[PDB]
Amino acid sequence: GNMINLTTDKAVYQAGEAVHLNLTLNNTTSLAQNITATAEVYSLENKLKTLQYTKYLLPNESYTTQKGEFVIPANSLANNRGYLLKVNISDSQNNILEQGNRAIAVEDDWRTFPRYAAIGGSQKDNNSVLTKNLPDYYRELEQMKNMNINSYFFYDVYKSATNPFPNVPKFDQSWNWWSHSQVETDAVKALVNRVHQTGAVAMLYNMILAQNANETAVLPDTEYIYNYETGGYGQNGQVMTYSIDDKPLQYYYNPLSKSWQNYISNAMAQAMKNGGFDGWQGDTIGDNRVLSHNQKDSRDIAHSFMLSDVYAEFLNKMKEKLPQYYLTLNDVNGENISKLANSKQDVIYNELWPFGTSALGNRPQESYGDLKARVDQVRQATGKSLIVGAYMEEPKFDDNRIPLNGAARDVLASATYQTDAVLLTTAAIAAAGGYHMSLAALANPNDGGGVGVLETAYYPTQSLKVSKELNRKNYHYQQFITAYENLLRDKVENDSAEPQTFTANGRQLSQDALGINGDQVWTYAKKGNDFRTIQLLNLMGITSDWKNEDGYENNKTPDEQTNLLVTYPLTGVSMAEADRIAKQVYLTSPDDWLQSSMISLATQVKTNENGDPVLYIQVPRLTLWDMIYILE
Numbered sequence: 001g002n003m004i005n006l007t008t009d010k011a012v013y014q015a016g017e018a019v020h021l022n023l024t025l026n027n028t029t030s031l032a033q034n035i036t037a038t039a040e041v042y043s044l045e046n047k048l049k050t051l052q053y054t055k056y057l058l059p060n061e062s063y064t065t066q067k068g069e070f071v072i073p074a075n076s077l078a079n080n081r082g083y084l085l086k087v088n089i090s091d092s093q094n095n096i097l098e099q100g101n102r103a104i105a106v107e108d109d110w111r112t113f114p115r116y117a118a119i120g121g122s123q124k125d126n127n128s129v130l131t132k133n134l135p136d137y138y139r140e141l142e143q144m145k146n147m148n149i150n151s152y153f154f155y156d157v158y159k160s161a162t163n164p165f166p167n168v169p170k171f172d173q174s175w176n177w178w179s180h181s182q183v184e185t186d187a188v189k190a191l192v193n194r195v196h197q198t199g200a201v202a203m204l205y206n207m208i209l210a211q212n213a214n215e216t217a218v219l220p221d222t223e224y225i226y227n228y229e230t231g232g233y234g235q236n237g238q239v240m241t242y243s244i245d246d247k248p249l250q251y252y253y254n255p256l257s258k259s260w261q262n263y264i265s266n267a268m269a270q271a272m273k274n275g276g277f278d279g280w281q282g283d284t285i286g287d288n289r290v291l292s293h294n295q296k297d298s299r300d301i302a303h304s305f306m307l308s309d310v311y312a313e314f315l316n317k318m319k320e321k322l323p324q325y326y327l328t329l330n331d332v333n334g335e336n337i338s339k340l341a342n343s344k345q346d347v348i349y350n351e352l353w354p355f356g357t358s359a360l361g362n363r364p365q366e367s368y369g370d371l372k373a374r375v376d377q378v379r380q381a382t383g384k385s386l387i388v389g390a391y392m393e394e395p396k397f398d399d400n401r402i403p404l405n406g407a408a409r410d411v412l413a414s415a416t417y418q419t420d421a422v423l424l425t426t427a428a429i430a431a432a433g434g435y436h437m438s439l440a441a442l443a444n445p446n447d448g449g450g451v452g453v454l455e456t457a458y459y460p461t462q463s464l465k466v467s468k469e470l471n472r473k474n475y476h477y478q479q480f481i482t483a484y485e486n487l488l489r490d491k492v493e494n495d496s497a498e499p500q501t502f503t504a505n506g507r508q509l510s511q512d513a514l515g516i517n518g519d520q521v522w523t524y525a526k527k528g529n530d531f532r533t534i535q536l537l538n539l540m541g542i543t544s545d546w547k548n549e550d551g552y553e554n555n556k557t558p559d560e561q562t563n564l565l566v567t568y569p570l571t572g573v574s575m576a577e578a579d580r581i582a583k584q585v586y587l588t589s590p591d592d593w594l595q596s597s598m599i600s601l602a603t604q605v606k607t608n609e610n611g612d613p614v615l616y617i618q619v620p621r622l623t624l625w626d627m628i629y630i631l632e
């Protein structure tokens with residue numbers, strides 16, 4: 001990495017707010033000398049500012065800049081944009097001693113460009129949320145802050161589905177039968193307060209229709225929902241019940257019940273106000289065909305309805321009854337975007353599994369291309385950037401602790417998460433215009449002082465270690481995703497123009513623009529108002545499965561490429577416009593060779609048989625992910 005320790009006072013900024021930076025100048029030399037920190041402020045390719053500070057330092061002496069010394073004043077940056085701070089530390093000979101880049105996010109609120117992370121109890125402490133772990137939480141949240149995280153998903157900090165956050169000092173989570181976790185409410189409040197200090201929001205996870213089965217009913221049975229057919233929630237004409245091993249765990253209420261709507265909204269309002277939360281991260285147990293209480297005995301299918309057919313109305317009622325609060329509902333596998341397109345969700349959140357049906361058609365949602373397709377489907381239906389839960393690897397064991405997958409064999413060997421696997425999944429979602437909710441503050445020692453990576457639905461579980469390599473590249477990836485949000489997900493659509501990628505020696509590397517096959521440089525274009533982009537995702541010599549359930553048994557580090565050619569056709573553009581464009585082609589990558597820096601590319605303008613111009617773009621390097629940026 002570097003030792004610049006580049007830090008900002010907040011995670012995110014209002015346009016009318018100053019950015020206070022701190023940075024550390026390290027005289028890593030044997031010579032007493034002026035050490036210079038130069039921080040260039042870029043808005044895409046354009047250098048807006050150079051900031052600069054010099055301090056005379058003795059050998060091995062360091063100096064951290066004080067409040068006021070590096071600042072970007074209020075009203076310096078346009079609103080709802082990402083920026084990059086490109087820092088070089090230099091000695092009195094103009095040798096570069098170190099370099100590090102940091103994004104700056106300026107935005108009204110988190111809804112335009114969500115960058116969402118999880119917070120959850122500590123595995124080493126029964127999954128509890130405890131005051132004694134605040135130091136580790138705060139350390140993780142300092143890191144997420146400098147990664148520009150703007151929102152936080154508080155997972156399993158609730159007492160019960162119907163009493164989510166009572167004003168008591170500590171409560172048991174009695175629905176936790178595996179580890180009997182507890183929550184100290186002062187811990188959750190301190191967490192929320194710390195999130196707020198960074199400019200970020202705190203979302204409370206809770207079900208929307210549920211009550212825990214061993215608590216008195218909050219409403220009488222006229223409000224319950226009933227099964228239309230016998231299945232996994234019990235018998236036709238019985239209350240929809242979630243059970244494990246013939247013990248009822250949860251009962252469900254009718255989304256159309258006005259009394260349930262008023263109950264749960266007010267219960268959430270109170271819970272949220274108790275914690276200082278900013279909104280509701282909603283969840284449902286799964287879809288079902290159901291009957292209202294008064295229809296419970298009907299065998300007439302036309303008297304029944306799919307719960308998902310009423311989610312939009314239910315949500316709209318929640319918004320209306322919770323107007324100052326953010327609202328979203330996890331749509332598992334993204335099955336219902338057309339149903340939910342007009343609901344007043346503030347953000348779209350889909351938890352995606354490899355076994356869901358792809359937005360592509362009749363195939364599992366198993367590859368990087370399937371993640372893009374779902375991101376695009378959401379964008380098309382709502383205009384919003386999809387937040388994706390795509391948990392990585394998920395080691396699983398049988399009863400003899402026999403591994404049921406390769407990742408589980410890595411667990412037995414005390415191995416790490418496969419760094420490039422995680423990064424390629426985050427790249428696939430981001431390059432498509434979405435955001436991979438992957439990062440977690442879990443006070444978990446397998447996270448080695450850094451932030452965790454979500455591996456399973458039960459967020460507190462960390463079976464594999466986060467290498468310092470993964471920690472450091474995750475940070476680079478977050479800066480890229482922030483600094484280039486206006487190119488990735490701000491009125492940017494798929495482009496019908498078809499870019500291709502070649503080596504210097506005759507191979508076409510781009511083979512399947514859908515991203516469903518591996519062993520290729522996955523290459524596709526996007527189109528914004530005055531630009532185009534080309535995403536290059538390196539899958540040379542690797543498979544396209546995003547989850548990497550095999551762990552290290554399936555290598556996910558793709559074959560590094562050098563001196564590639566990318567062609568991009570300029571159908572119907574004149575030679576003079578093409579020549580202007582050809583001088584305005586740039587590249588950036590979150591990978592170590594650039595760490596979000598942008599460079600100019602050598603480009604030639606050629607034509608087809610009919611005088612139609614085509615850019616021939618030289619790409620120095622591709623490690624995992626490159627973005628070409630074409631001003632047009």
Ligand SMILES: OCCCCCO[C@H]1O[C@H](CO)[C@@H](O)[C@H](O)[C@H]1O
Pocket residue numbers: 156207283284285286330332457458
């Ligand atoms: O979209 C479906 C997500 C919910 C799946 C099961 O969740 C439930 O069960 C989980 C444990 O399996 C709990 O951690 C959680 O609080 C509770 O809501």
